């Protein structure tokens, strides 16, 4: 699978370069992934600027899995899905219950 393509995909990334590099971006729902050691899922930061309090926002959410038809991946036991592209996706049109749902996929 794999999905170091996708606009929001960050691989080598980090839960505080996301952020940085979301940061920098600059987008509302700014959206990114990055693998993780897990059960073999993604983690998805999602930034928006705001928060005048701590702004932009960059949030790390991570693509549960699990071992569904073919449903595996989720974040936020709402939506599993097969690949974090369609778990992006349907974050990413869609609009999952999170900072935006996948407002615009950030690539460091």
């Not at 699978?1 to 990334?13: A, F, Q, R």
């Not at 509302?28 to 983690?43: I, K, L, N």
Request: aromatic content about 12%; glycine content about 6%.
């Amino acid at each position: 699978n794999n999905l170091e393509t996708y606009e929001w995909y960050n691989k080598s990334i980090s839960r505080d370069k996301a952020e940085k590099l979301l940061l920098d971006t600059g987008k509302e729902g700014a959206f990114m992934v990055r693998d993780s050691r897990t059960p073999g899922t993604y983690t998805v930061s999602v930034f928006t600027k705001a928060i005048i309090s701590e702004n932009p926002c960059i949030k790390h959410y991570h693509i549960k899995e699990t071992n569904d038809s073919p449903k595996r991946y989720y974040v936020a036991e709402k939506y599993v899905f097969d690949s974090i592209p369609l778990l992006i996706q349907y974050h990413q049109y869609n609009g999952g219950g999170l900072v935006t749902r996948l407002r615009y996929p950030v690539c460091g």
